[PDB]
PDB file of all heavy atoms in Angstrom:
ATOM      1  N   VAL A   1     -25.485 -18.501 -23.737  1.00 51.32           N
ATOM      2  CA  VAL A   1     -26.274 -19.408 -22.927  1.00 51.32           C
ATOM      3  C   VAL A   1     -27.547 -19.774 -23.656  1.00 51.32           C
ATOM      4  O   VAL A   1     -27.877 -20.941 -23.718  1.00 51.32           O
ATOM      5  CB  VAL A   1     -26.555 -18.827 -21.540  1.00 51.32           C
ATOM      6  CG1 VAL A   1     -25.215 -18.469 -20.891  1.00 51.32           C
ATOM      7  CG2 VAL A   1     -27.438 -17.592 -21.628  1.00 51.32           C
ATOM      8  N   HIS A   2     -28.217 -18.801 -24.268  1.00 55.16           N
ATOM      9  CA  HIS A   2     -29.415 -19.011 -25.066  1.00 55.16           C
ATOM     10  C   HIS A   2     -29.260 -20.213 -25.996  1.00 55.16           C
ATOM     11  O   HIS A   2     -30.200 -20.994 -26.130  1.00 55.16           O
ATOM     12  CB  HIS A   2     -29.746 -17.715 -25.824  1.00 55.16           C
ATOM     13  CG  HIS A   2     -30.599 -17.877 -27.060  1.00 55.16           C
ATOM     14  ND1 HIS A   2     -31.579 -18.823 -27.280  1.00 55.16           N
ATOM     15  CD2 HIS A   2     -30.477 -17.139 -28.207  1.00 55.16           C
ATOM     16  CE1 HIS A   2     -32.024 -18.658 -28.539  1.00 55.16           C
ATOM     17  NE2 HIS A   2     -31.385 -17.641 -29.138  1.00 55.16           N
ATOM     18  N   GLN A   3     -28.104 -20.367 -26.643  1.00 55.72           N
ATOM     19  CA  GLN A   3     -27.950 -21.452 -27.595  1.00 55.72           C
ATOM     20  C   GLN A   3     -27.812 -22.755 -26.831  1.00 55.72           C
ATOM     21  O   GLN A   3     -28.537 -23.709 -27.112  1.00 55.72           O
ATOM     22  CB  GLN A   3     -26.778 -21.219 -28.558  1.00 55.72           C
ATOM     23  CG  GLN A   3     -26.686 -22.404 -29.540  1.00 55.72           C
ATOM     24  CD  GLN A   3     -25.953 -22.088 -30.842  1.00 55.72           C
ATOM     25  OE1 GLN A   3     -25.562 -20.957 -31.107  1.00 55.72           O
ATOM     26  NE2 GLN A   3     -25.759 -23.082 -31.698  1.00 55.72           N
ATOM     27  N   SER A   4     -26.905 -22.819 -25.854  1.00 55.18           N
ATOM     28  CA  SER A   4     -26.640 -24.109 -25.232  1.00 55.18           C
ATOM     29  C   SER A   4     -27.886 -24.618 -24.512  1.00 55.18           C
ATOM     30  O   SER A   4     -28.249 -25.783 -24.612  1.00 55.18           O
ATOM     31  CB  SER A   4     -25.482 -23.965 -24.267  1.00 55.18           C
ATOM     32  OG  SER A   4     -24.298 -23.708 -24.977  1.00 55.18           O
ATOM     33  N   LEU A   5     -28.551 -23.696 -23.825  1.00 55.64           N
ATOM     34  CA  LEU A   5     -29.785 -23.808 -23.075  1.00 55.64           C
ATOM     35  C   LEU A   5     -30.920 -24.323 -23.950  1.00 55.64           C
ATOM     36  O   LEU A   5     -31.817 -24.979 -23.439  1.00 55.64           O
ATOM     37  CB  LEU A   5     -30.106 -22.416 -22.515  1.00 55.64           C
ATOM     38  CG  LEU A   5     -31.300 -22.316 -21.565  1.00 55.64           C
ATOM     39  CD1 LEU A   5     -31.079 -23.134 -20.293  1.00 55.64           C
ATOM     40  CD2 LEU A   5     -31.428 -20.839 -21.186  1.00 55.64           C
ATOM     41  N   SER A   6     -30.900 -24.047 -25.256  1.00 53.44           N
ATOM     42  CA  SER A   6     -31.877 -24.650 -26.155  1.00 53.44           C
ATOM     43  C   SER A   6     -31.684 -26.164 -26.187  1.00 53.44           C
ATOM     44  O   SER A   6     -32.639 -26.918 -26.012  1.00 53.44           O
ATOM     45  CB  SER A   6     -31.770 -24.063 -27.564  1.00 53.44           C
ATOM     46  OG  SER A   6     -32.042 -22.679 -27.531  1.00 53.44           O
ATOM     47  N   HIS A   7     -30.450 -26.621 -26.410  1.00 57.56           N
ATOM     48  CA  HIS A   7     -30.162 -28.047 -26.499  1.00 57.56           C
ATOM     49  C   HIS A   7     -30.406 -28.723 -25.151  1.00 57.56           C
ATOM     50  O   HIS A   7     -30.967 -29.815 -25.095  1.00 57.56           O
ATOM     51  CB  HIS A   7     -28.727 -28.259 -26.993  1.00 57.56           C
ATOM     52  CG  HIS A   7     -28.491 -27.619 -28.338  1.00 57.56           C
ATOM     53  ND1 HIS A   7     -28.981 -28.067 -29.546  1.00 57.56           N
ATOM     54  CD2 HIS A   7     -27.832 -26.442 -28.571  1.00 57.56           C
ATOM     55  CE1 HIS A   7     -28.614 -27.175 -30.484  1.00 57.56           C
ATOM     56  NE2 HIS A   7     -27.921 -26.165 -29.937  1.00 57.56           N
ATOM     57  N   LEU A   8     -29.990 -28.066 -24.066  1.00 59.11           N
ATOM     58  CA  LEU A   8     -30.188 -28.543 -22.710  1.00 59.11           C
ATOM     59  C   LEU A   8     -31.672 -28.756 -22.470  1.00 59.11           C
ATOM     60  O   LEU A   8     -32.088 -29.871 -22.194  1.00 59.11           O
ATOM     61  CB  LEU A   8     -29.549 -27.574 -21.704  1.00 59.11           C
ATOM     62  CG  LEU A   8     -29.611 -27.997 -20.220  1.00 59.11           C
ATOM     63  CD1 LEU A   8     -30.814 -27.374 -19.506  1.00 59.11           C
ATOM     64  CD2 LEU A   8     -29.643 -29.512 -20.010  1.00 59.11           C
ATOM     65  N   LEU A   9     -32.484 -27.708 -22.575  1.00 57.47           N
ATOM     66  CA  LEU A   9     -33.900 -27.808 -22.265  1.00 57.47           C
ATOM     67  C   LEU A   9     -34.578 -28.858 -23.136  1.00 57.47           C
ATOM     68  O   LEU A   9     -35.359 -29.639 -22.613  1.00 57.47           O
ATOM     69  CB  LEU A   9     -34.585 -26.442 -22.383  1.00 57.47           C
ATOM     70  CG  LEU A   9     -34.157 -25.478 -21.265  1.00 57.47           C
ATOM     71  CD1 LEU A   9     -34.766 -24.106 -21.541  1.00 57.47           C
ATOM     72  CD2 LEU A   9     -34.628 -25.940 -19.881  1.00 57.47           C
ATOM     73  N   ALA A  10     -34.270 -28.937 -24.431  1.00 60.34           N
ATOM     74  CA  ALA A  10     -34.878 -29.932 -25.311  1.00 60.34           C
ATOM     75  C   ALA A  10     -34.719 -31.365 -24.777  1.00 60.34           C
ATOM     76  O   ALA A  10     -35.583 -32.211 -24.986  1.00 60.34           O
ATOM     77  CB  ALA A  10     -34.276 -29.805 -26.713  1.00 60.34           C
ATOM     78  N   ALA A  11     -33.600 -31.649 -24.110  1.00 58.11           N
ATOM     79  CA  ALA A  11     -33.292 -32.934 -23.514  1.00 58.11           C
ATOM     80  C   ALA A  11     -33.912 -33.065 -22.126  1.00 58.11           C
ATOM     81  O   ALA A  11     -34.514 -34.076 -21.790  1.00 58.11           O
ATOM     82  CB  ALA A  11     -31.776 -33.045 -23.378  1.00 58.11           C
ATOM     83  N   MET A  12     -33.700 -32.084 -21.264  1.00 59.08           N
ATOM     84  CA  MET A  12     -34.031 -32.160 -19.854  1.00 59.08           C
ATOM     85  C   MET A  12     -35.534 -32.030 -19.637  1.00 59.08           C
ATOM     86  O   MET A  12     -36.048 -32.451 -18.603  1.00 59.08           O
ATOM     87  CB  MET A  12     -33.234 -31.078 -19.136  1.00 59.08           C
ATOM     88  CG  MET A  12     -33.107 -31.322 -17.638  1.00 59.08           C
ATOM     89  SD  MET A  12     -31.629 -30.513 -16.969  1.00 59.08           S
ATOM     90  CE  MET A  12     -31.814 -30.876 -15.210  1.00 59.08           C
ATOM     91  N   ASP A  13     -36.249 -31.504 -20.631  1.00 57.22           N
ATOM     92  CA  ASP A  13     -37.706 -31.484 -20.670  1.00 57.22           C
ATOM     93  C   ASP A  13     -38.253 -32.909 -20.703  1.00 57.22           C
ATOM     94  O   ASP A  13     -39.358 -33.167 -20.242  1.00 57.22           O
ATOM     95  CB  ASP A  13     -38.182 -30.696 -21.892  1.00 57.22           C
ATOM     96  CG  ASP A  13     -39.692 -30.483 -21.861  1.00 57.22           C
ATOM     97  OD1 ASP A  13     -40.129 -29.725 -20.966  1.00 57.22           O
ATOM     98  OD2 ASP A  13     -40.372 -31.032 -22.755  1.00 57.22           O
ATOM     99  N   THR A  14     -37.467 -33.864 -21.213  1.00 57.65           N
ATOM    100  CA  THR A  14     -37.881 -35.259 -21.250  1.00 57.65           C
ATOM    101  C   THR A  14     -37.792 -35.919 -19.862  1.00 57.65           C
ATOM    102  O   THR A  14     -38.178 -37.076 -19.713  1.00 57.65           O
ATOM    103  CB  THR A  14     -37.115 -36.035 -22.344  1.00 57.65           C
ATOM    104  OG1 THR A  14     -35.866 -36.526 -21.911  1.00 57.65           O
ATOM    105  CG2 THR A  14     -36.902 -35.208 -23.626  1.00 57.65           C
ATOM    106  N   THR A  15     -37.294 -35.212 -18.838  1.00 55.24           N
ATOM    107  CA  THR A  15     -37.233 -35.715 -17.471  1.00 55.24           C
ATOM    108  C   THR A  15     -38.375 -35.090 -16.667  1.00 55.24           C
ATOM    109  O   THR A  15     -39.099 -34.247 -17.186  1.00 55.24           O
ATOM    110  CB  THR A  15     -35.859 -35.405 -16.848  1.00 55.24           C
ATOM    111  OG1 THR A  15     -35.807 -34.119 -16.262  1.00 55.24           O
ATOM    112  CG2 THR A  15     -34.722 -35.519 -17.867  1.00 55.24           C
ATOM    113  N   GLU A  16     -38.517 -35.432 -15.384  1.00 54.96           N
ATOM    114  CA  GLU A  16     -39.515 -34.789 -14.533  1.00 54.96           C
ATOM    115  C   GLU A  16     -38.881 -34.157 -13.294  1.00 54.96           C
ATOM    116  O   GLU A  16     -39.589 -33.806 -12.354  1.00 54.96           O
ATOM    117  CB  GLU A  16     -40.619 -35.789 -14.160  1.00 54.96           C
ATOM    118  CG  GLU A  16     -41.428 -36.210 -15.392  1.00 54.96           C
ATOM    119  CD  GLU A  16     -42.874 -36.515 -15.006  1.00 54.96           C
ATOM    120  OE1 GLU A  16     -43.628 -35.521 -14.862  1.00 54.96           O
ATOM    121  OE2 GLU A  16     -43.206 -37.704 -14.828  1.00 54.96           O
ATOM    122  N   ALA A  17     -37.557 -33.978 -13.281  1.00 56.60           N
ATOM    123  CA  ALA A  17     -36.909 -33.337 -12.148  1.00 56.60           C
ATOM    124  C   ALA A  17     -36.987 -31.813 -12.290  1.00 56.60           C
ATOM    125  O   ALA A  17     -37.174 -31.286 -13.387  1.00 56.60           O
ATOM    126  CB  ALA A  17     -35.455 -33.805 -12.066  1.00 56.60           C
ATOM    127  N   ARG A  18     -36.798 -31.082 -11.189  1.00 61.31           N
ATOM    128  CA  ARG A  18     -36.548 -29.647 -11.272  1.00 61.31           C
ATOM    129  C   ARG A  18     -35.260 -29.406 -12.043  1.00 61.31           C
ATOM    130  O   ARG A  18     -34.344 -30.226 -12.003  1.00 61.31           O
ATOM    131  CB  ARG A  18     -36.455 -29.011  -9.881  1.00 61.31           C
ATOM    132  CG  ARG A  18     -37.833 -28.539  -9.420  1.00 61.31           C
ATOM    133  CD  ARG A  18     -37.706 -27.883  -8.045  1.00 61.31           C
ATOM    134  NE  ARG A  18     -38.976 -27.276  -7.629  1.00 61.31           N
ATOM    135  CZ  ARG A  18     -39.225 -26.776  -6.413  1.00 61.31           C
ATOM    136  NH1 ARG A  18     -38.285 -26.822  -5.468  1.00 61.31           N
ATOM    137  NH2 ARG A  18     -40.412 -26.232  -6.146  1.00 61.31           N
ATOM    138  N   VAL A  19     -35.186 -28.250 -12.699  1.00 62.44           N
ATOM    139  CA  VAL A  19     -34.119 -27.900 -13.607  1.00 62.44           C
ATOM    140  C   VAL A  19     -33.583 -26.574 -13.116  1.00 62.44           C
ATOM    141  O   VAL A  19     -34.079 -25.505 -13.477  1.00 62.44           O
ATOM    142  CB  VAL A  19     -34.644 -27.837 -15.048  1.00 62.44           C
ATOM    143  CG1 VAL A  19     -33.521 -27.456 -16.013  1.00 62.44           C
ATOM    144  CG2 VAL A  19     -35.228 -29.195 -15.431  1.00 62.44           C
ATOM    145  N   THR A  20     -32.592 -26.643 -12.240  1.00 63.03           N
ATOM    146  CA  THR A  20     -32.043 -25.448 -11.657  1.00 63.03           C
ATOM    147  C   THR A  20     -30.795 -25.105 -12.449  1.00 63.03           C
ATOM    148  O   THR A  20     -29.791 -25.805 -12.343  1.00 63.03           O
ATOM    149  CB  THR A  20     -31.749 -25.692 -10.179  1.00 63.03           C
ATOM    150  OG1 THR A  20     -32.800 -26.379  -9.532  1.00 63.03           O
ATOM    151  CG2 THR A  20     -31.632 -24.326  -9.531  1.00 63.03           C
ATOM    152  N   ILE A  21     -30.853 -24.056 -13.270  1.00 62.44           N
ATOM    153  CA  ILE A  21     -29.722 -23.682 -14.095  1.00 62.44           C
ATOM    154  C   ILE A  21     -28.757 -22.873 -13.224  1.00 62.44           C
ATOM    155  O   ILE A  21     -29.176 -22.010 -12.448  1.00 62.44           O
ATOM    156  CB  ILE A  21     -30.218 -22.950 -15.361  1.00 62.44           C
ATOM    157  CG1 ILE A  21     -29.287 -23.187 -16.563  1.00 62.44           C
ATOM    158  CG2 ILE A  21     -30.371 -21.443 -15.197  1.00 62.44           C
ATOM    159  CD1 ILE A  21     -29.624 -24.493 -17.284  1.00 62.44           C
ATOM    160  N   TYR A  22     -27.464 -23.164 -13.346  1.00 63.22           N
ATOM    161  CA  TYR A  22     -26.393 -22.468 -12.649  1.00 63.22           C
ATOM    162  C   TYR A  22     -25.411 -21.971 -13.705  1.00 63.22           C
ATOM    163  O   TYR A  22     -25.451 -22.387 -14.865  1.00 63.22           O
ATOM    164  CB  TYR A  22     -25.667 -23.404 -11.669  1.00 63.22           C
ATOM    165  CG  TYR A  22     -26.375 -23.723 -10.360  1.00 63.22           C
ATOM    166  CD1 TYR A  22     -27.510 -24.550 -10.359  1.00 63.22           C
ATOM    167  CD2 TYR A  22     -25.843 -23.275  -9.133  1.00 63.22           C
ATOM    168  CE1 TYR A  22     -28.117 -24.935  -9.150  1.00 63.22           C
ATOM    169  CE2 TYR A  22     -26.439 -23.666  -7.918  1.00 63.22           C
ATOM    170  CZ  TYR A  22     -27.574 -24.508  -7.919  1.00 63.22           C
ATOM    171  OH  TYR A  22     -28.128 -24.908  -6.739  1.00 63.22           O
ATOM    172  N   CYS A  23     -24.504 -21.087 -13.299  1.00 61.91           N
ATOM    173  CA  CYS A  23     -23.450 -20.600 -14.165  1.00 61.91           C
ATOM    174  C   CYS A  23     -22.262 -20.254 -13.272  1.00 61.91           C
ATOM    175  O   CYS A  23     -21.525 -21.147 -12.862  1.00 61.91           O
ATOM    176  CB  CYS A  23     -23.999 -19.429 -14.990  1.00 61.91           C
ATOM    177  SG  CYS A  23     -22.757 -18.823 -16.162  1.00 61.91           S
ATOM    178  N   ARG A  24     -22.117 -18.980 -12.909  1.00 62.32           N
ATOM    179  CA  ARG A  24     -21.222 -18.544 -11.853  1.00 62.32           C
ATOM    180  C   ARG A  24     -21.955 -17.465 -11.058  1.00 62.32           C
ATOM    181  O   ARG A  24     -23.149 -17.251 -11.263  1.00 62.32           O
ATOM    182  CB  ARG A  24     -19.884 -18.086 -12.460  1.00 62.32           C
ATOM    183  CG  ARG A  24     -18.715 -18.592 -11.609  1.00 62.32           C
ATOM    184  CD  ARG A  24     -17.382 -18.254 -12.277  1.00 62.32           C
ATOM    185  NE  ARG A  24     -16.258 -18.742 -11.470  1.00 62.32           N
ATOM    186  CZ  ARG A  24     -14.969 -18.509 -11.747  1.00 62.32           C
ATOM    187  NH1 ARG A  24     -14.630 -17.842 -12.854  1.00 62.32           N
ATOM    188  NH2 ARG A  24     -14.018 -18.941 -10.919  1.00 62.32           N
ATOM    189  N   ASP A  25     -21.263 -16.763 -10.170  1.00 57.46           N
ATOM    190  CA  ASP A  25     -21.832 -15.826  -9.204  1.00 57.46           C
ATOM    191  C   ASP A  25     -22.229 -14.472  -9.816  1.00 57.46           C
ATOM    192  O   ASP A  25     -22.243 -13.469  -9.107  1.00 57.46           O
ATOM    193  CB  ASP A  25     -20.784 -15.592  -8.099  1.00 57.46           C
ATOM    194  CG  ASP A  25     -19.563 -14.816  -8.612  1.00 57.46           C
ATOM    195  OD1 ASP A  25     -18.983 -15.266  -9.627  1.00 57.46           O
ATOM    196  OD2 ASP A  25     -19.219 -13.760  -8.033  1.00 57.46           O
ATOM    197  N   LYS A  26     -22.531 -14.383 -11.117  1.00 57.16           N
ATOM    198  CA  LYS A  26     -22.300 -13.129 -11.838  1.00 57.16           C
ATOM    199  C   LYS A  26     -23.458 -12.694 -12.720  1.00 57.16           C
ATOM    200  O   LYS A  26     -24.481 -13.359 -12.804  1.00 57.16           O
ATOM    201  CB  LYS A  26     -20.994 -13.267 -12.648  1.00 57.16           C
ATOM    202  CG  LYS A  26     -20.015 -12.111 -12.398  1.00 57.16           C
ATOM    203  CD  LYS A  26     -19.707 -12.023 -10.901  1.00 57.16           C
ATOM    204  CE  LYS A  26     -18.342 -11.418 -10.598  1.00 57.16           C
ATOM    205  NZ  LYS A  26     -18.049 -11.558  -9.157  1.00 57.16           N
ATOM    206  N   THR A  27     -23.264 -11.576 -13.420  1.00 58.96           N
ATOM    207  CA  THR A  27     -24.198 -10.985 -14.367  1.00 58.96           C
ATOM    208  C   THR A  27     -24.629 -11.981 -15.450  1.00 58.96           C
ATOM    209  O   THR A  27     -25.729 -11.871 -15.985  1.00 58.96           O
ATOM    210  CB  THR A  27     -23.512  -9.751 -14.967  1.00 58.96           C
ATOM    211  OG1 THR A  27     -22.853  -9.051 -13.929  1.00 58.96           O
ATOM    212  CG2 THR A  27     -24.481  -8.807 -15.675  1.00 58.96           C
ATOM    213  N   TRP A  28     -23.793 -12.975 -15.773  1.00 57.23           N
ATOM    214  CA  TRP A  28     -24.199 -14.068 -16.651  1.00 57.23           C
ATOM    215  C   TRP A  28     -25.494 -14.711 -16.155  1.00 57.23           C
ATOM    216  O   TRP A  28     -26.386 -14.970 -16.952  1.00 57.23           O
ATOM    217  CB  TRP A  28     -23.082 -15.113 -16.784  1.00 57.23           C
ATOM    218  CG  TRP A  28     -22.297 -15.052 -18.060  1.00 57.23           C
ATOM    219  CD1 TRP A  28     -22.702 -15.571 -19.243  1.00 57.23           C
ATOM    220  CD2 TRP A  28     -20.969 -14.494 -18.308  1.00 57.23           C
ATOM    221  NE1 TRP A  28     -21.723 -15.381 -20.199  1.00 57.23           N
ATOM    222  CE2 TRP A  28     -20.635 -14.719 -19.677  1.00 57.23           C
ATOM    223  CE3 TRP A  28     -20.005 -13.834 -17.514  1.00 57.23           C
ATOM    224  CZ2 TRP A  28     -19.414 -14.310 -20.232  1.00 57.23           C
ATOM    225  CZ3 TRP A  28     -18.774 -13.420 -18.061  1.00 57.23           C
ATOM    226  CH2 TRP A  28     -18.479 -13.656 -19.416  1.00 57.23           C
ATOM    227  N   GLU A  29     -25.619 -14.954 -14.851  1.00 58.19           N
ATOM    228  CA  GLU A  29     -26.825 -15.503 -14.246  1.00 58.19           C
ATOM    229  C   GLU A  29     -28.039 -14.619 -14.536  1.00 58.19           C
ATOM    230  O   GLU A  29     -29.100 -15.127 -14.890  1.00 58.19           O
ATOM    231  CB  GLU A  29     -26.579 -15.718 -12.748  1.00 58.19           C
ATOM    232  CG  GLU A  29     -27.713 -16.516 -12.093  1.00 58.19           C
ATOM    233  CD  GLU A  29     -28.716 -15.680 -11.289  1.00 58.19           C
ATOM    234  OE1 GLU A  29     -28.608 -14.431 -11.294  1.00 58.19           O
ATOM    235  OE2 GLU A  29     -29.529 -16.300 -10.569  1.00 58.19           O
ATOM    236  N   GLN A  30     -27.877 -13.297 -14.466  1.00 56.85           N
ATOM    237  CA  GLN A  30     -28.939 -12.357 -14.811  1.00 56.85           C
ATOM    238  C   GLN A  30     -29.370 -12.552 -16.266  1.00 56.85           C
ATOM    239  O   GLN A  30     -30.559 -12.544 -16.583  1.00 56.85           O
ATOM    240  CB  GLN A  30     -28.447 -10.925 -14.572  1.00 56.85           C
ATOM    241  CG  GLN A  30     -29.590  -9.913 -14.452  1.00 56.85           C
ATOM    242  CD  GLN A  30     -29.041  -8.516 -14.163  1.00 56.85           C
ATOM    243  OE1 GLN A  30     -27.986  -8.136 -14.655  1.00 56.85           O
ATOM    244  NE2 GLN A  30     -29.733  -7.725 -13.351  1.00 56.85           N
ATOM    245  N   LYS A  31     -28.412 -12.728 -17.177  1.00 56.06           N
ATOM    246  CA  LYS A  31     -28.733 -12.963 -18.581  1.00 56.06           C
ATOM    247  C   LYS A  31     -29.518 -14.255 -18.717  1.00 56.06           C
ATOM    248  O   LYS A  31     -30.541 -14.274 -19.393  1.00 56.06           O
ATOM    249  CB  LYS A  31     -27.466 -12.972 -19.443  1.00 56.06           C
ATOM    250  CG  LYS A  31     -26.903 -11.553 -19.444  1.00 56.06           C
ATOM    251  CD  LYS A  31     -25.571 -11.445 -20.192  1.00 56.06           C
ATOM    252  CE  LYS A  31     -24.887 -10.141 -19.763  1.00 56.06           C
ATOM    253  NZ  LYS A  31     -23.877  -9.684 -20.742  1.00 56.06           N
ATOM    254  N   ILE A  32     -29.079 -15.323 -18.059  1.00 56.72           N
ATOM    255  CA  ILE A  32     -29.771 -16.598 -18.103  1.00 56.72           C
ATOM    256  C   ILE A  32     -31.206 -16.424 -17.598  1.00 56.72           C
ATOM    257  O   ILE A  32     -32.118 -17.007 -18.175  1.00 56.72           O
ATOM    258  CB  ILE A  32     -28.982 -17.666 -17.328  1.00 56.72           C
ATOM    259  CG1 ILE A  32     -27.606 -17.908 -17.974  1.00 56.72           C
ATOM    260  CG2 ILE A  32     -29.762 -18.982 -17.358  1.00 56.72           C
ATOM    261  CD1 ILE A  32     -26.627 -18.615 -17.034  1.00 56.72           C
TER     262      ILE A  32
END
């Protein structure tokens, strides 16, 4: 997630909306 999230944030930072990251119901979310 760290890697994809780098590219995501670099783009979505150019917007002014809230940025609610989702994944699934799981420990992955804790890592994020």
Side-chain angles (χ1 to χ4, degrees):
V1 305
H2 158 32
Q3 180 158 355
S4 292
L5 186 63
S6 298
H7 302 288
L8 183 265
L9 290 174
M12 199 155 176
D13 188 68
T14 85
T15 86
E16 294 211 80
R18 270 181 173 171
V19 180
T20 316
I21 211 84
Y22 284 71
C23 183
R24 222 175 180 185
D25 69 307
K26 232 57 153 188
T27 318
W28 257 280
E29 190 258 5
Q30 199 178 36
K31 292 176 198 201
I32 297 162

